[PDB]
């Protein structure tokens, strides 16, 4: 089982940028294959036998290599090329895959739009309270969100989830949910969702008070 190591493991590239993805093999192989995957759909054959483009693959793509080092090259990065690329060898059993390289597209920076939501009354009937916060449509994806209860920073029970790049505007979104017991929720007054992003030196703050 020849082991395949891809490099880099994640990378963003501007439109028009030359992109090169490397596949290394623990032992020599005679060809490398490449597959494209976008979230939701099955892997698509991209390049077979080292430098042959599969049916439908546009010309800005190419492959090469030999021995223990092959590569895939996008001459000019395009939004539709943003996906995950796997290499595969078929020169010795068992056939093996690389770990994949996630490729993202760069776009203008964007401050998030931040919304905060107190517990639904229906949830509160059950003895449980979730404060949810939506940080929407920002770039880049690096972002800091923090929860303050009564002005005091809060670490437990916080749960975040980023979406992948939007297919429409290449932007990111993330949600941040702080979950509490209802008894506990009713103990404090102000609740704060606070986000710090490179698009500004002032954190974006959302708050509400109960009653």
């Amino acid at each position: 089982q020849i082991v395949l190591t891809q490099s880099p493991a994640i990378m963003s590239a501007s439109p028009g940028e030359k992109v090169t993805i490397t596949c290394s093999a623990s032992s020599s192989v005679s060809y490398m294959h490449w597959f494209q995957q976008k979230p939701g759909t099955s892997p698509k054959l991209w390049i077979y036998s080292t430098s042959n483009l599969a049916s439908g693959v546009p010309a800005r793509f190419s492959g090469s290599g030999s021995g223990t080092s092959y590569s895939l090259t996008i001459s000019r990065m395009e939004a539709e090329d943003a996906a995950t690329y796997y290499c595969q060898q078929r020169s010795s059993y068992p056939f093996t895959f690389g770990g994949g390289t996630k490729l993202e597209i760069k776009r203008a920076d964007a401050a998030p739009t931040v919304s905060i939501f107190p517990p639904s009354s229906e949830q509160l009937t059950s003895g449980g309270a979730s404060v949810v916060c939506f940080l929407n449509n920002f770039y880049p994806k690096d972002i800091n969100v923090k929860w303050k209860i009564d002005g005091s920073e809060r670490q437990n029970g916080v749960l975040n989830s980023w979406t992948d790049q939007d297919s429409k505007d290449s932007t990111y979104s993330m949600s941040s949910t702080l979950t509490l017991t209802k008894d506990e929720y009713e103990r404090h007054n102000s609740y704060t969702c606070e986000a710090t992003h490179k698009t500004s030196t002032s954190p974006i703050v959302k708050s509400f008070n109960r009653n």
Binding site: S42, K44, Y48, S49, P94, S120, S126, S130, S161, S175
Partner: protein, 220 residues
């Protein structure tokens, strides 16, 4: 050309299961066929490979004794015997076509999802999230829906039964104890809400639940 997998779902660790892949659109009796699997949030892992006569079948060394590959060219289906499944066998299972004999995996199905777990099937609670009690000078208004405490994946939020598409984000599920949680934000202009119905639809096939939650404004 089409490859359809099926036979997957929730399995207790130590358990057994059987996937089938139904091929049509081509002469199935002529192609080497393969299974590849992908764990959630993880890369592709080659499972095995089988020829048209079932006389040469290859596996990844691990799982070579607990997975068995077979085909039935009369029935145009390929199979995967899964036995002794464990947590790390939790993955989406693809069937694929090895192009002629030499080289390329050219066609893939969508996969058959398998969760290996003793945790029991659990439907989500679905809470509507209307904005801060107020009235903004905002030209847009953002609503949210909270889907909490289910097992296993997947689930399916829509908004107004799939009629509200633009302005939606559906965040990926996240584990916790033994259950998932996700949320889905949607943004519309203030003129359209709350003068119009926006409704969170959440279906969870594993528990055959499907619930709707209208987003009404807060109260007192």
């Amino acid at each position: 050309v089409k490859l359809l997998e099926s036979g997957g779902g929730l399995v207790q660790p130590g358990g057994s299961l059987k996937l089938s892949c139904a091929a049509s659109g081509f002469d199935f009796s002529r192609y080497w066929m393969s299974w590849v699997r992908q764990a959630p949030g993880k890369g592709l892992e080659w499972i095995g490979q089988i020829n048209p006569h079932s006389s040469t079948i290859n596996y990844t060394p691990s799982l070579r004794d607990k997975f068995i590959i077979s085909r039935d060219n009369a029935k145009n289906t390929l199979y995967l015997q899964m036995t002794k499944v464990r947590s790390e066998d939790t993955a989406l299972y693809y069937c694929a076509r090895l192009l002629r004999y030499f080289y390329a995996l050219d066609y893939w199905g969508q996969g058959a999802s398998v969760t290996v777990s003793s945790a029991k099937t659990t439907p989500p609670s679905v809470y509507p999230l209307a904005p801060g009690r107020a009235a903004a000078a905002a030209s847009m208004v953002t609503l949210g829906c909270l889907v909490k405490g289910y097992f296993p994946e997947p689930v399916t939020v829509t908004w107004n039964s799939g009629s509200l598409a633009a302005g939606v984000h559906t965040f990926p599920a996240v584990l916790q104890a033994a259950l998932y949680t996700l949320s889905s934000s949607v943004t519309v202009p203030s003129s359209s809400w709350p003068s119009e119905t926006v409704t969170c639809n959440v279906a969870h096939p594993a528990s055959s639940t499907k619930v709707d939650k209208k987003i009404v404004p807060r109260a007192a």
